[PDB]
DNA sequence: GGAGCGGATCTCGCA
DNA sequence: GCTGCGAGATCCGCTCC
DNA sequence: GGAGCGGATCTCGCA
DNA sequence: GCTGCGAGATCCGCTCC
């Protein structure tokens, strides 16, 4: 749990995997994997722009 | 979306030419930096690709190197079915086009890490093939390995003895029963249904037990 | 059998495989695969039932080494002396439980004698004597002796004698050492004998040469009768022949062939 | 299944040990120099080297009843039972094999000159010229039994596949969503048949709109 | 569970190798390695996903050769010259194409360096550099070199590019060649990988 | 239909199409050799018509 | 956020705080010009707040 | 049906008969060149048969 | 909330408090605090 | 009632 | 004588503690 | 069982 | 201090005669 968190963090730093991959590999919670992947500056910089749309008056 | 089906395409990335092969079933990808788009380079790359693992079919579009005299001879020599898509229809090879996005987006991350471009390509192959682990928790390489392992024909040839049975069936059009159409060899027998290969249409059909009868076995 | 001969021939022309690989892949008889491999000009320009014999000693005792080229089967037995009579005893006692067809050996005092060649002539198994100048043979022979002699000391203390360790070495090598899908070398040999025995059923009735005519079908048009052509092998309604013009093997059904009296 | 027996014979002031098989009929001969247990031990381990037995039955012997002998045979892991056999079939087979081998060796006397060559040649003739059933040698039927048991033990591999697959259908002229995952029932050339959960009906789907997945946990 | 005591007893009685025990009892690879290390006779004197790396000269052509010890799978490429950068690129591509776990090689300039050692620790693969002690790797790699050069000599005139001939030789020696129970040196590797995957999934 | 060799019958060889119904024997067509054969009635098992 | 000039989008700028969140677009505060701007949802990249 | 040259679609031509109907595309017969052509579904206009 | 996990762990080692206080004063999710106090042998053995 | 969680749904850009 | 595609975000409705 | 029929669903191109 | 949209084809599932 806590012990393998640095291992998952360094693995994502080295390879830039996905949150689902980290959760399925190291058994960390999905929330923890989401927090790790969202905190990656490289991932944030190259992420695709948000897709929200509205409607006319 | 075949099992041993591969789609090949070229792409450009900052004065670099990359040739990409995409497996339809598993989703495994293989990219290589190529100096140009000549026929000889494509032939060398494709026969190396065949050497690494054995495919059965290829899909590509019109191109100076995809279609020519020497390349078709090479593909016939290897024994690979080649299909060419409709011209001016890039949507035909949709899978490789989408993998182009999935490759460029990930490769953007690994450029600063490695000084060599080929190193970045190998790293993105790592992170897109082995470290993906998407879906149920199986990487595309695992799916490809499993499919290749189960493809062995010696397993199917282990047993040569099996019970053989024949059956009588009739068609069903708009709920109106037809007439019995010859004896047919049973393909597989389950519960509540059966499968029959119609020779007149040369197609596989499913018939419920209410429209299926069995001939007496030889005695 | 008959149908897939041209496929095997063209595959070998493309890739230059070996007779054993062709036999295991396309299911063609071993004789046919050997004929195809031997007729290759490039190959002219490693097989089952092929063994090599080398001399070695340990603790001042005489021991013989029998290494199979394909199955990797090693056999050994205590030998009283290096004389010709004792050598013949061991050589034909080796055939007592094995059925090989080829053998290679170097020059030795007991290898050549006035009665040695006539004795193997009765057996009928072809044997060739020469100098193994091939670097592959030199490096292959070296590893076998080390592999067999390393296992000797692993079981000496509780066995009484060296002849007791003789069987222990074979137990270590031929029984437990397994590759592939847990296949032992003796399993490989036994399985090889299975497909080796099949061709006897076909060659039993094929030991009598016949000449027959063949007719080539072209778009449903019989054309004419051509020949005579030698019948290569028989099948269930299929006969393979050699084409004089195109120099390719052709397959014809049993309904387009006649019998020519000798 | 895989039963072996031992019997000794005396001829010309010499002792010959014979290994006999019951189900198949394997016969092996060797010249025993002395009655010391070392020769019996080395012969047994040589036989274990050249053969793969599972069960062995034999009578009593002066050297057989020895703590070292039982320790060695348990080291090899083979089983053995004491007591004189009471099966008439085994006695008849042993007697017939012994009389046949004696007749063959006494008929073959003039052809040879040596002795060990003579024993091994008699072994060759007995193990080769013996045609049983459809002209099958005892070694031939032995290897037949070995390959049959091997293939019947390894046949389970082809049965434990149970691969999983996805599927999709065409609705209103357009492909549908990837329904699944699910287990395929029967897969032939061109198409496979699968069980649907939405309507509980069997559906046949071609190979051009399916994906293959190993079974989950 | 009882397979572990059975393997321990059998190794005590006969002292076989780890690969045979793994194949014939299905025991975990770690347990087999532990049993092997616990044998003093074996210690004082053929692993899955174990590779050997070597260089080959072919009438001025430099060839990098990777040989799998357990399965006769050969991966050959052409290298411009013996350089650390080229070797690192080649080894990263090799790790990209396969899933290795250990590597063995000799003492060389490009083989032994701080950069390449750091990169291999980055990948996470055990490395062993030194003179081989098991009298099997040297003979196996010699046979691989001999067969590779023989096939390259045979198949060179058929194709135009040298890399084309190398690919053809790899095809012949990895897929088309067969042995044992009609199995190829490439199907054996796939079977071993599938067995490792299923064992890892079953355990954790 | 089953073949007989010196009084020893063979196997049913699977179903086959009939040609003509004679008295005491019938004529059938072989698929392996494309040869017309004659089989006695006692060696022929009739397939009942659909019910 | 990024600003489009002559149709071509500009380089990404930020990070900044969402002063007013709207479904169609948002309002952001610029440091270079000290002026308020409205950016559509197609030119924004939501990120967790840094620390 | 219409034919695309250098990406730009051409003028509509026909009407003609659908020789082979396929989900991805169809095959049509040309009168000017007396040659078979394959046209994707995005360049076709289905109409009832004229009389 | 990952950066303060080692700091929270060393604070737990210094004080040996309960999971609820750690969650409520550090912002750590409740499950993580429960697992942290489960890993604590002293906190586990006295329950 | 708090809690995380599996999955349906959305757009956009490869050519 | 053939073909669109999915990665990366976001909530609902769910059930379990 | 034939019959039409209301409605969910699809893509593409305005700028 | 705000925003995507629908016309024009095609079948399913329906019920009614
Ligand atoms: Ca493209
Ligand atoms: Ca406008
Ligand atoms: Zn990252
Ligand atoms: Zn050849
Ligand atoms: Zn040991
Ligand atoms: Zn505590």
Numbering used by the authors:
A (entry chain I): 1 to 57
B (entry chain A): 58 to 276
C (entry chain C): 1 to 45, 58 to 274
D (entry chain D): 60 to 276
E (entry chain B): 2 to 46, 58 to 216
F (entry chain H), G (entry chain N), H (entry chain F): 226 to 276
I (entry chain M): 1 to 47
Can you provide the manuscript's text about this entry?
Reconstitution of the intasome from the maedi-visna virus (MVV), an ovine lentivirus, revealed a large assembly containing sixteen IN subunits. Retroviral integrase (IN), the enzyme responsible for this process, catalyzes two consecutive reactions: (i) 3′-processing, during which IN hydrolyses 2–3 nucleotides at the vDNA ends to liberate 3′-hydroxyls attached to invariant CA dinucleotides, and (ii) strand transfer, wherein IN utilizes the 3′-hydroxyls to cleave the chromosomal DNA, simultaneously joining the 3′ vDNA ends to target DNA (tDNA) strands. The amino-terminal domain (NTD) consists of a compact three-helical bundle stabilized by coordination of a Zn2+ ion; the catalytic core domain (CCD) features the RNaseH fold and harbors the invariant D,D-35-E catalytic triad; and the carboxy-terminal domain (CTD) adopts an SH3-like beta-barrel structure (reviewed in Jaskolski et al.).
Here, we describe high-resolution structures of the MVV intasome in two functional states: (i) prior to engagement of tDNA and (ii) following strand transfer. We collected single-particle cryo-EM data on the MVV intasome assembled in the form of the CSC and purified under conditions used in our previous study. The reconstruction was refined to an overall resolution of 3.4 Å. In agreement with the previously reported MVV CSC structure, which was refined to ~5 Å resolution, the present reconstruction lacked features consistent with LEDGF/p75. The CSC and STC structures recapitulated the MVV intasome architecture harboring sixteen IN subunits in a tetramer-of-tetramers arrangement. The CIC is formed from a pair of CCD dimers provided by IN tetramers I and II, plus a pair of synaptic CTDs derived from IN tetramers III and IV. Comparison of the CSC and STC structures confirmed that the intasome does not undergo extensive conformational changes upon tDNA binding and strand transfer. The CTDs from eight IN subunits form a pair of C2 symmetry-equivalent tetrads stabilizing the hexadecameric assembly via intra- and inter-tetramer CTD-CTD interactions as well as via contacts with vDNA. Using site-directed mutagenesis, we demonstrate that the hexadecameric assembly is essential for MVV IN strand transfer activity and virus infectivity.
